[PDB]
Amino acid sequence: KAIPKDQRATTPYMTKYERARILGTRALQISMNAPVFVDLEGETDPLRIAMKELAEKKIPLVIRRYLPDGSFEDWSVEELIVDL
Amino acid sequence: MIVPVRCFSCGKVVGDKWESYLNLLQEDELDEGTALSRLGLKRYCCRRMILTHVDLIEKFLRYNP
Amino acid sequence: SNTLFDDIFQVSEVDPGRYNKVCRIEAASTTQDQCKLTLDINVELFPVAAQDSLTVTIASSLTRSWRPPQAGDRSLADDYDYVMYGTAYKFEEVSKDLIAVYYSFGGLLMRLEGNYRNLNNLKQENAYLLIRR
Amino acid sequence: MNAPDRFELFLLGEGESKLKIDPDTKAPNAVVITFEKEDHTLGNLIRAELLNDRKVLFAAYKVEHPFFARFKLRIQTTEGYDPKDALKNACNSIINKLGALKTNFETEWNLQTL
Amino acid sequence: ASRHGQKGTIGITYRREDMPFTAEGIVPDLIINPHAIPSRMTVAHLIECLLSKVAALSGNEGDASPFTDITVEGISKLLREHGYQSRGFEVMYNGHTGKKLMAQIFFGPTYYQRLRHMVDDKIHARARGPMQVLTRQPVEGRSRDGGLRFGEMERDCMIAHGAASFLKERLMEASDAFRVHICGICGLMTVIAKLN
Amino acid sequence: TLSHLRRTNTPIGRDGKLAKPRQLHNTHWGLVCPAETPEGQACGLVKNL
Amino acid sequence: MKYDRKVPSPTGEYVKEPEWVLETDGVNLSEVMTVPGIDPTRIYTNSFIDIMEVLGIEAGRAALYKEVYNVIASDGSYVNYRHMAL
Amino acid sequence: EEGPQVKIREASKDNVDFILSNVDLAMANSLRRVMIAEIPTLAIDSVEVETNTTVLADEFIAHRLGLIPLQSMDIEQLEYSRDCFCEDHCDKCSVVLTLQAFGESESTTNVYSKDLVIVSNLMGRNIGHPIIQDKEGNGVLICKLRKGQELKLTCVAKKGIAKEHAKWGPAAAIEFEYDPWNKLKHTDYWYEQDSAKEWPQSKNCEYEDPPNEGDPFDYKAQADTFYMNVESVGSIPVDQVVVRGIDTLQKKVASILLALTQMDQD
Amino acid sequence: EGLVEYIDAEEEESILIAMQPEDLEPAEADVDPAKRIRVSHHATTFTHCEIHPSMILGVAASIIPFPDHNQSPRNTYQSAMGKQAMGVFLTNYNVRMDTMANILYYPQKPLGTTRAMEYLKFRELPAGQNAIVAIACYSGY
Amino acid sequence: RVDFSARTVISGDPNLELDQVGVPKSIAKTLTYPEVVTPYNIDRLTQLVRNGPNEHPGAKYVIRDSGDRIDLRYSKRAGDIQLQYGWKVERHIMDNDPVLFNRQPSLHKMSMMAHRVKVIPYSTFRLNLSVTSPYNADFDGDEMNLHVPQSEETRAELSQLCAVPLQIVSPQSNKPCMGIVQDTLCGIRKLTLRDTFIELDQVLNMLYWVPDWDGVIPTPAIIKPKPLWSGKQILSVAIPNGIHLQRFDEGTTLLSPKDNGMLIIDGQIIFGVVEKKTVGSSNGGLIHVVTREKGPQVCAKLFGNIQKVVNFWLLHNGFSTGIGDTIADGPTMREITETIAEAKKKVLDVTKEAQANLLTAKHGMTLRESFEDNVVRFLNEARDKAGRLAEVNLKDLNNVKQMVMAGSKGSFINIAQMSACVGQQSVEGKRIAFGFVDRTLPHFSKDDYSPESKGFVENSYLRGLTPQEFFFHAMGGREGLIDTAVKTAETGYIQRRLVKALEDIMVHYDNTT
Amino acid sequence: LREVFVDGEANWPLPVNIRRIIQNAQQTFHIDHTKPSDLTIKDIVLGVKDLQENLLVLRGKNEIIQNAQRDAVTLFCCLLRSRLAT
Ligand SMILES: [Mg+2]
Ligand SMILES: [Zn+2]
Ligand SMILES: [Zn+2]
Ligand SMILES: [Zn+2]
């Protein structure tokens, strides 16, 4: 249904399932020969690269969180607080 | 089924002492435990090597072609 | 670069609780009737019989890997016969004006009692134990 | 099936020096020698005798896993004394000992009857 | 396995050098873990040892028949009349270093059986291969170079874990998977796809 | 081989779940073996004399 | 039966103030409830099926969960509420 | 003389009871291990089967043969088949034997290892002779046979050591022991009332002075004196098994010093 | 010569039986501190006596040494494996064409035996090897 | 059924990490992870391709954008081939690939955990002991499975979610589900004792064995004449820094004379014998802490160390078990005999006292029913206690006891039943019944209610049962083996239903359920 | 509590082990049982009060939810305050 950046309600944190898919999803793309927005300090593993792409929060993705009723809340990996 | 050459455990040779052993019985009419010590088998590892073994082979031979 | 405690005690008893190589020892001082002592000890490298005249010391010196012999001609505040090294885990107050500290040498424990090491006894790991005669 | 060939317990393969020396960064003046196609028969020995060199601060070995005949060795010494040299000494020292043993043995043996 | 439901497998082979040894010179053909004793309380295995470690010495087929008048106390008597520890224990030195072992160990002969079912009769891997006709899924057994069943249980387990895709995989990209043409109208497998 | 020649099968089709017969009865002493019996599935039903 | 109940001592402490109780062996809650002498507040039938018809679902649940917790707990098998709960 | 001396006690053709003194345990054992699985010896390492009508199956016999102790005093001068540039065994790295038997006697025909026939050039050097210590003189019964039971073999001895397969090692069992009166407490005797009585006393005790209660515990004490006894299979005189051991080892410690040099250049 | 009879289960109900022919017979006019503890002979009605108890066993168990020294269940398993072991299932194997079969290179008649074996022809066709064993924690393998 | 799956016998390797799984080469060379040719890999990739599909580090298929396979084992241009950006190379599974290990039957999240691959010789899957229970497997020829991920995202779901270390704390019991067993455990204790001192030479090798050892030989607990180190001391090297743990068993007093409980400060055992309670799957155990304090990572890495250090020391201190550990002090045997006899009269008394109608029915309902409940209760009371005698007479050097103390294996019961006395057998509760018209065995006189007939095994597993004992004992055991044959039938069904009922139930984003 | 855990039972499954969290706080600053603190009594109470303000489990911007929050939190805080008592 769409939810404004405001009136936001979900967790401010990142569900492990979220991270893991992102991480996976990214690495996949990296190995798909995709642009990598960080200095590979000499990394050759798409995951490892993704993990870096993440600890510098430079991953162009937005998790769209869907709610039982259909409406969703979009959260970027830039925002999402990565504790774990 | 044929004596084994050398005792699995320690390795010393053995396969020759067969007839020698099987002899100190029927002829020199002795008791196993003593026969062995007389064949140089001092430790049970080897000792057991002989004492046990069953010459099935002999029964095999009794067959035909 | 100092010392931290000196005195002589007398063993009240030796207890080998199913320990063929070590016995916990308790002994009283020959000065203040307040100073009591409780200490585990290796009864194989340094036997001890009830009622003996032992000398106890401490100090934090003479933390970088430990060097084997060589010093067969170096420093040696080892004019003793038993010398361990461990840590203290607690500073208890046995009521009144009585404070006692507990020690441990990789398994061997130690308990002391009195009140004049207010500025003497430290609260750090370092602390070598000593015994002689 | 998966059984490696028995001879890989003493026969070095393609590109593998009996020795391989690496600098240990944990401490200063220390090394980690990787003795290929070797085992306790040797390791423990070098290690042991390596311990008599009063100029040696640390010496210990270990077979990283039984499936693989090879072992690591770590050595450390008094600043100003390279380990490798300490390593040699050990070996030599070992030989001299064995030599004498070889010798002294025969001697006693010849003096025997039966 | 021995004869007291003491089944076990091998976990590695050593050689006389590595094996622990007894001053006598002897060394073990086999090494079982003591933890396979208490909770299982199989004393007969334990006893067979002591009995045999003796019969092997006297060359007198040791009798271990059920209810009889034989004693452990009575065997230890024999065994010591032979020089070795009355209990069967023996001193032993560490193969690698050769230093005595602080403890002593139970050392003796013990009939063991070698039962079928040998590893190589089981190892079995696959990654794509023959394919059931009707189903179009992998096939059964290793003999036919088949695959492995990823069943309900292993399914429920993934769902439990949350591994959304590692699941979709095991199920599509790793087995069935097929492409088809649906009609946007009568939602069926009708559509005549001439892919050219 | 012997063992397989002295074996018994007890056909309890239907009544397989009881505090049943799988039980080691007293009358069994001497005629059947006490221990030699299969685990699970069809236990105590099959007896070796 | 003489059960050992624990209860608020006047002094605050918790203490064992035993009580006698009757355990049926057939069940018709609806009416054994409306009997004088019983505390129709602490009554309970291991048959949650009833304790549901009488007392009302929500309590039913309570019984249900309670019954289940036990079955599993006689083995000394812990299982975090939440699960059985769910 | 200088260091690790020796005092051989009893000693014969097959055993070497000796008191190896003033050394390090480590070494004492090292040697032991070497004597066990690193002393080169020869033994049949291949069998070409022409014809076998025995009960025993091919490899079965094959196997047996391997074990058959073979002579090898002059083994140090017969290169390891993996080096004898010859493609697959030269006379310069392997002996070759033969075995042929036939059921002539209408009464069980024993096929011993004496029936082994060397076919290649020995080049004059004790090697490849089926060792025999039998009283009658036919050591190692390799197989039996009835009527027209035939057996035609082709054995190809080679170098190799226990490490690579036991059929090689010339050890067969080595006694080892020390501190018979557990003075270093390298062991805690398991008992029931009194270790002393319960735990047998080894003969070696005499060669070292007993305890003497009262005396404290000697902590600086280490381990000299090792009561060893090397037995032999025969493929080498007991003595060499001791020497060649002290050598192979000696040789190994060298290959390290040697390798260190071949590495000092760069 | 009526010196032994065939008694079934039913006719077993109406009789008494002695375990041992000896111990359970003489009079009571010391006892080993090692042995087990058997009850007594409080009866003088013994209709019959047991040849030997061991016979309550079956093929399987008959092979177990000292089964009277183990948790009943252990013997129940061991009598399901001696069936999965190997040995010499006959001596004419070299002339048999049955699908699958296993033979031990070097069988060995056990050092620990049961008189009961004697009739099971075991010493004549073993199924294992007297292995020198050491119960110790070593490599941790 | 699925492709890219494997299965073989498994065994224990005290040298692998928790998260690892030793795959045998044979399999590695058969299972392939389709990798994508990319500048990051081209070099290393082509290398494999060349390496062929027979040398280990290799591959066995290459695939072009044209969607077509290249059978590297044939295809004339095998050795040829110049890889391409966008191509893929089904390669051999290599050390450290994430895999889905598992044992059946699967009814636990912890029945399928991801693992770090580790190609090895011989044909058996290798796993770490401490990850035995989660799979609940033994090495008695237990076959396990293995599925290999296929995408990059897939292998990520195994790495970041189903990874063994991520599974150390179980949700269905809010506690650790992985411990420390056998040797390691049974030994970590022998190594801990105050009475356990280690000298230089060894102290070093141990230090070394520990992969994170800051390379700082720790100052010896003792120095005086001969410098020694305490078992606790070095084991402590395995325990990271910042660790804190207070225990207090029974007689514990910051000087615990019995060396009870346990104190661990800044990662150093200050006092107290280490064992099951401290290092097991217990709640506030060492593991539970480390995992919550340092990180799943640090933890797994912890087992190792402990294991390695310990295992090693054990290898040299040695450990055994034997009949000698089941024989107790001569007097304690008689003292037991009579402790049994006395319990027979205390029965006999209640026997006639009930044959003379002088027995209070008791709330216990039925006089007879009330009779038994007294007899049983009298004999059991005797066993448990007959043993409480041996249990205390078995010196602190008795292996069996040691395995029990450390808790590696065994309960005191096991001691009784072996060295003191088995006990009274049973069928549905009621001691051995009367199948034999008013008696147990035809070797008994009708209407004999004495214990030796209702099924009471007086001998210890050491002396050995009697015909009768033996027989009853049987009837008794053979019981479980049955309610297991039927339980198993219905168990399964329950298990499924529950599961099939709550599939769809998951915590949504509003935190609802 | 006594209206909830009638049994009197005090030990329960609860997130955040606070027994330890402090044991750490203890020897991590090498605190000495001799010299006095430095906390304002305002410090303690007024803080432990702000703490709970942040143990958010639910988040909503409205009442209904912000009310359910205070609930899912309750049983915990009680342990909290139980521990962070002036
Ligand atoms: Mg199983
Ligand atoms: Zn031998
Ligand atoms: Zn349509
Ligand atoms: Zn050549």
CB contact (8 A) between residue A21 and residue E162: no
Nearest to J162 among E39, E125, E163 (CB): E163
Q: Two tokens at G55?
A: 């007392």
Query: Min CA distance, F35 vs chain J (Å)?
Result: 7
The span from the CA of E18 to the CA of E6, in Å, is 25
Note the ligand closest to the C-alpha atom of E5. Answer: 1
Q: What does each C-alpha distance from H216 to G25, H37, H209, J197 come to in angstroms?
A: 76, 41, 16, 18
Identity (one letter) of the amino acid at H143? C
Backbone angles phi, psi at H27, to 5 degrees: -50, -50
The alpha carbon of E37 is separated from its chain's Cα centroid by a whole number of angstroms, namely 17
Q: Ligand 3 mean position to E189 CA, how many Å?
A: 9
CB contact (8 A) between residue J443 and residue I17: yes
H/E segment holding residue J491: helix J487-501
Q: Which residues of A touch E161 (CB under 8 A)?
A: none
Radius of gyration of chain F (CA): 11
Q: Are B44 and I132 in contact (CB under 8 A)?
A: yes
Query: Min CA distance, D91 vs chain H (Å)?
Result: 6
The span from the CA of E137 to the CA of J80, in Å, is 34
Q: What does each C-alpha distance from A71 to B32, J509, K62 come to in angstroms?
A: 92, 11, 18
Q: Are J204 and D58 in contact (CB under 8 A)?
A: yes
Instruction: Decide which of 3.40.50.9100, 1.10.3720.10, 3.40.50.620, 2.40.50.140 is the CATH code for C1-133.
Output: 2.40.50.140
Look at the block and give the residue holding tokens 């069904």: J493
Q: Ligand 3 mean position to E188 CA, how many Å?
A: 7
The span from the CA of B64 to the CA of H128, in Å, is 35
**Domains, chain B, ranges and CATH?**
1-65 (1.10.10.60)
H/E segment holding residue H202: none
Look at the block and give the residue holding tokens 């032994």: I4
Identity (one letter) of the amino acid at G34? T
SS3 A3: coil
The span from the CA of J198 to the CA of H198, in Å, is 28
Q: How does DSSP classify residue F40?
A: T
Q: Are E182 and E188 in contact (CB under 8 A)?
A: yes
The span from the CA of B3 to the CA of I106, in Å, is 8
The span from the CA of J426 to the CA of J431, in Å, is 5
Count of beta carbons in the 10 Å neighbourhood of residue E9:
18
Task: Provide the experimental method for this PDB entry.
Answer: cryo-EM
Q: Which of residues 2-61 of B touch H (CB under 8 A)?
A: 2-3, 5-6, 10-13, 15-16, 18-20, 43, 57-58, 60-61
Q: Are C108 and J221 in contact (CB under 8 A)?
A: yes
Nearest to J215 by CA among D24, D44, C125, D48: D24
Count of beta carbons in the 10 Å neighbourhood of residue K83:
12
Q: Two tokens at H84?
A: 């004898």
The CATH code of the domain that includes D67 is 3.30.1360.10
Angle in degrees, 0-180, between the axes of helices J296-317 and J200-209, rounded to the nearest 10:
150
Query: Min CA distance, I105 vs chain H (Å)?
Result: 8
Q: What does each C-alpha distance from F5 to C74, D111, F47, H223 come to in angstroms?
A: 86, 69, 12, 63
Residue of H nearest to C44 (CA): H217
Interface contact E160, partner A, CB < 8 A:
no
Q: Ligand 1 mean position to J138 CA, how many Å?
A: 7
Nearest to H165 by CA among D6, J351, J84: D6
The span from the CA of I50 to the CA of I20, in Å, is 7
SS3 B19: helix
Interchain CB contacts (distance < 8 Å): G and K: 6
Q: Ligand 2 mean position to I132 CA, how many Å?
A: 10
Q: Which residues of D touch E (CB under 8 A)?
A: 1, 39-41, 44, 66-67
Q: Which residues of H touch E82 (CB under 8 A)?
A: none
∠ CA J456-J458-J464, nearest 5°, is 115
Q: Are D49 and D73 in contact (CB under 8 A)?
A: no
Q: What does each C-alpha distance from B39 to B7, E53, H70, H233, I109 come to in angstroms?
A: 14, 19, 21, 15, 21
The alpha carbon of H112 is separated from its chain's Cα centroid by a whole number of angstroms, namely 21
Kindly provide the resolution of this structure in angstroms, with one decimal: 36.0
Mutation target among J270, J392, J395 for the C interface, most CBs of C within 10 A? J270
Q: Are J96 and J117 in contact (CB under 8 A)?
A: yes
The span from the CA of E167 to the CA of C44, in Å, is 63
The span from the CA of I72 to the CA of E40, in Å, is 11
CB contact (8 A) between residue E125 and residue J112: no
Q: What does each C-alpha distance from B9 to E16, E19, I132 come to in angstroms?
A: 9, 11, 7
Q: Which of residues 83-112 of I touch F (CB under 8 A)?
A: 83, 89-90
The alpha carbon of H169 is separated from its chain's Cα centroid by a whole number of angstroms, namely 4
Q: Per-residue DSSP letters for H118-172?
A: E-S---SSS-S-B----SSS--SEEE---SS--EEEEEEEE---GGG-TTS-S-S
Which CATH topology does E131-196 take?
DCoH-like (3.90.1800)
User: What is the domain range of residue D71?
Assistant: 1-114
Q: Are I113 and E61 in contact (CB under 8 A)?
A: yes
Radius of gyration of chain I (CA): 21
Query: Min CA distance, H218 vs chain C (Å)?
Result: 8
The span from the CA of E48 to the CA of H74, in Å, is 46
Ligand 3 (single-atom ion) residues, CB below 5 Å: E 183, 185-186
Nearest to E104 by CA among E77, E86, E82, E80: E86
Q: Are E123 and J123 in contact (CB under 8 A)?
A: yes
Q: Are J444 and I45 in contact (CB under 8 A)?
A: no
Interface contact A6, partner K, CB < 8 A:
no
CB contact (8 A) between residue I94 and residue H55: yes
Q: Are strands I112-113 and E62-63 parallel, antiparallel or unpaired?
A: parallel
Note the ligand closest to the C-alpha atom of E29. Answer: 2
Q: Where are the alpha helices (DSSP H) in chain H?
A: 25-37, 58-67, 195-198, 238-261
Query: Min CA distance, D58 vs chain C (Å)?
Result: 9
The span from the CA of J510 to the CA of A34, in Å, is 34
Sign of CA dihedral J285, J291, J296, J300: negative
Q: Are E39 and J407 in contact (CB under 8 A)?
A: no
Angle in degrees, 0-180, between the axes of helices E164-171 and A16-31, rounded to the nearest 10:
60
SS3 J82: coil
Q: Which chains lie within 8 Å of chain J at 3 or more CB pairs, if any?
A: A, C, D, E, F, G, H, I, K
Identity (one letter) of the amino acid at C34? Q
Nearest to J396 by CA among C104, C44, H188: H188
CB contact (8 A) between residue F23 and residue J479: yes
The span from the CA of F21 to the CA of J435, in Å, is 12
Mutation target among H190, H191, H219, H220 for the J interface, most CBs of J within 10 A? H190
The span from the CA of H247 to the CA of G26, in Å, is 92
Interchain CB contacts (distance < 8 Å): D and H: 119
Q: Two tokens at E14?
A: 């050593």
Q: Two tokens at C110?
A: 């130690």
